[PDB]
């Protein structure tokens, strides 16, 4: 019997079942003996007993490994490096930039008068002026900034704060003349105005051009996991109580629908958008704010037929609005709408690129249209003439990674933050000119604890089960031998058109260095890496393609002697938890360790909790007889293998006790079912629970994850 056992007991309800309609079988009665664990922690002693017993059990196993502390100290020392964003020009004639001196809980906002920016981000420190220090907001540094928008006048700054990481927030307002001071004690937000906008679940704030107020989306007053219902658009006037905010839109008929508004840069036109699922399709309306008082008494005109396409404002020129849209263009395009001829529809300005996903369109230096394409699992910046749509060439085409682009239509320059698996963040300045532009290196992030020249990222292609060519990035020390001995950390997502882009994580390079490991990112189907068709081949009845791509990546690494067959660790979060639990179910013999973060695992019950019903466009509708059949085949909660052909890998599940985005019940129920199916291991299945994440929490979680992988795969730390 394994010395760490036995598992904490978990009450079973042997009578708890639901009957689902099935095209193949007529109906299927599914038993759920852990259905009680769907009741929130707050509302159930049973759920409390489970969380507390499972938490202590995991904490005992993890803290017994001395490498847990070794990892925490290694991570803490190495993470103590200065981090910053690109400069962002604002309407108060300051550049704003995020800064962390190394080990602060949260990023701080700094600023510098435009023209004095050559004095910031030096050996001496951030320079400029401290504007907003989120660390002041709470005692533990758990209250995070969820977003901010400066008023067009530059006198006001609207910002979102989530208390206790809870994914509910309040919106606050402060004067740009009221920066945080370094002398302020923690626990309070001094210098803010009385404005308090409660009951907000996502930050979307749009100021009017008069800087008198802003549109926002909120919910009825409410830790719980019931469906997110009755999203409403409100307009808040600066200085008033929230009780005075004017209702702009509700749709009582469709409580699951999410709604918001965006204004054109000029502030003249308002775009209403509703979504009814996670798909890139909207119900869309346009109002002319010059013709309307703000409220439910506004003259909405239809932009296009509902549920065919998504529309995002990218600019305006009087009555003409620039849209980034997927209308009959799944990889997105740029089209113009004339609000003066709404029946004439959209005119194409930039045609769909059939081999490249259009991620953003923005206007710079008056009439330069800057397009960011995703092609070959990395960003490309294309410059177009705004008037004709004519190509003016590429910039930064030598850099393969991702870009954050900063700059407005009225600015002749941009700041571009470049990053990859190996580049932690270089800020370039690009200055547009009469014929050609000028590129300069502004500032680079430097990591004192690590020699980036020791590492490489390989670009390879491998065939999946069905012969589809899949691209994979492989990060490793240059001096690791491909002799089939190296451990692997293999990370995937596969869904919702979300690309796994080259992304800097110091933690992952330290895993590669300390364990002589490879870090593998297969660009599996479900993402946008090769365009929207890459998502379509990895969703609904084709979700199995995602798991097969990931499995085939592992087999390819073993076959080509990158990795020992006995040291594969896999990792995945949210939708990525469908990936890790399905792959663990379908090929347990491939994997030695499985890390699941905030996992979606019950593919039948997901629609019943918070935002889950929106994911029916991705996974299918489990209450639909045809969809039920293909979902039930892989639903990881329902497909745990019998012991015997199966040695189950060691498995660590991360979750909070309350989480709005993925209800922790997915992890609660799956951990119980795994422990019950495999009561004697031999490899432990553990739930690591936390009762805008802080640096401290991220490192303590990373130290559990890495020390658990080390223990489970028999790795020695080679410091």
């Amino acid at each position: 019997f394994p010395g760490w056992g036995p598992y904490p007991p978990v009450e079973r309800d042997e009578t708890s079942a639901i009957t689902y309609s099935s095209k193949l079988h007529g109906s299927v009665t599914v038993r759920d003996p852990y259905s009680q664990l769907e009741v929130p922690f707050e509302d159930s002693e049973e759920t409390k007993a489970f969380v507390h017993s499972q938490r202590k059990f995991a904490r005992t196993y993890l803290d017994e490994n001395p490498d847990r502390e070794a990892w925490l100290e290694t991570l803490k020392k190495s993470w103590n490096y200065r981090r910053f964003s690109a400069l962002k020009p604002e309407s108060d004639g300051h550049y704003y930039f995020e800064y962390n001196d190394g080990l602060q809980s949260q990023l701080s906002l700094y600023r510098v008068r435009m023209g004095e920016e050559d004095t910031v981000l030096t050996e001496s420190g951030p320079g400029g002026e401290l504007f907003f220090n989120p660390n002041l907001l709470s005692l533990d540094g758990n209250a995070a900034l969820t977003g901010f928008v400066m008023s067009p006048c530059g006198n006001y700054w609207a910002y979102g704060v989530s208390e206790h990481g809870s994914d509910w927030m309040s919106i606050y307002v402060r004067k740009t003349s009221s920066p945080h001071l370094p002398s302020q004690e923690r626990g309070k937000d001094p210098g803010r105005m009385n404005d308090k906008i409660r009951h907000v679940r996502f930050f979307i704030v749009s100021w009017t051009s008069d800087s008198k107020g802003f549109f926002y989306s909120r919910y009825p007053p409410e830790k719980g996991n019931a469906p997110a219902m009755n999203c409403m658009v409100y307009y808040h006037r600066i200085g008033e109580d929230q009780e005075s905010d004017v209702l702009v839109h509700e749709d009582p008929e469709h409580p699951f629908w999410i709604s918001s508004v965006q204004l054109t840069p000029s502030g003249r036109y308002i775009l209403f958008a509703a979504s009814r699922d996670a798909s890139h399709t909207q119900l869309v309306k346009i109002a002319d704010l010059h013709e309307n008082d703000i409220g439910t008494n506004m003259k909405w005109k239809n932009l296009h037929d509902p549920w065919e396409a998504r529309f995002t404002i990218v600019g305006d020129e009087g009555s003409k609005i620039y849209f980034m849209t997927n209308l009959k263009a799944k990889n997105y395009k740029v089209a113009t709408f004339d609000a003066n001829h709404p029946d004439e529809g959209l005119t194409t300005l930039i045609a769909e690129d059939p081999n490249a996903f259009l991620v953003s369109a923005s206007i710079h230096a008056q009439d330069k249209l800057l397009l960011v394409y995703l092609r070959n699992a990395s960003h490309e910046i294309h410059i177009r003439d705004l008037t004709t749509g004519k190509p003016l060439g590429r910039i930064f085409e030598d850099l393969l990674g991702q870009f954050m682009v900063s700059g407005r239509r009225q600015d002749n320059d941009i700041f571009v933050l470049f990053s990859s698996f190996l580049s932690p963040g270089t800020v370039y300045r690009y200055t547009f000119g009469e014929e050609k532009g000028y590129r300069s290196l502004f500032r680079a992030i430097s990591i004192p604890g690590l020699n980036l020249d020791d590492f490489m990222t390989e670009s390879v292609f491998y065939p999946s089960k069905d012969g589809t060519s899949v691209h994979m990035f492989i990060t490793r020390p240059k001096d690791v031998l491909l002799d089939g001995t190296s451990p692997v950390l293999q990370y995937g997502y596969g869904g919702f058109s979300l690309a796994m882009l080259p992304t800097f994580s110091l933690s992952t390079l330290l895993f590669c260095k300390i364990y002589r490991a490879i870090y593998a990112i297969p660009n599996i189907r479900g993402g946008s890496e090769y365009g929207e068709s890459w998502h379509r081949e990895g969703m609904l009845d084709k979700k199995q393609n995602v798991f097969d791509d990931f499995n085939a990546a592992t087999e390819w690494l073993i076959a080509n002697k990158y990795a020992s067959k006995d040291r594969i660790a896999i990792r995945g979060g949210a939708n990525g938890g469908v990936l890790t639990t399905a792959c663990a179910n379908q090929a347990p013999g491939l994997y030695r360790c499985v890390i699941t973060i905030e996992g979606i695992i019950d593919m039948l019950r997901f629609p019943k909790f918070t935002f889950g019903a929106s994911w029916r466009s991705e996974y299918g509708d489990p209450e639909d007889p045809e969809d039920f059949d293909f979902i039930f085949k892989y639903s990881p909660y329902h497909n745990i293998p019998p012991p015997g052909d199966t040695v189950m890998p060691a498995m660590l599940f991360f979750t909070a006790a309350y989480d709005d985005r993925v209800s922790p019940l997915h992890t609660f129920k799956h951990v119980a079912a795994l422990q019950h199916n495999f009561p004697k291991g031999p490899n432990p299945c553990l739930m690591r629970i936390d009762l805008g994440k802080s640096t401290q929490e991220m490192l303590e979680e990373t130290a559990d994850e890495y020390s658990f992988i080390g223990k489970s795969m028999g790795l020695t730390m080679q410091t």
Binding site: H280, F496, A574, E598, T610, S614, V662
Partner: peptide, 7 residues
């Protein structure tokens, strides 16, 4: 656009 589980 939507509320998606990521990370």
């Amino acid at each position: 656009i939507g509320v998606i589980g990521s990370v």
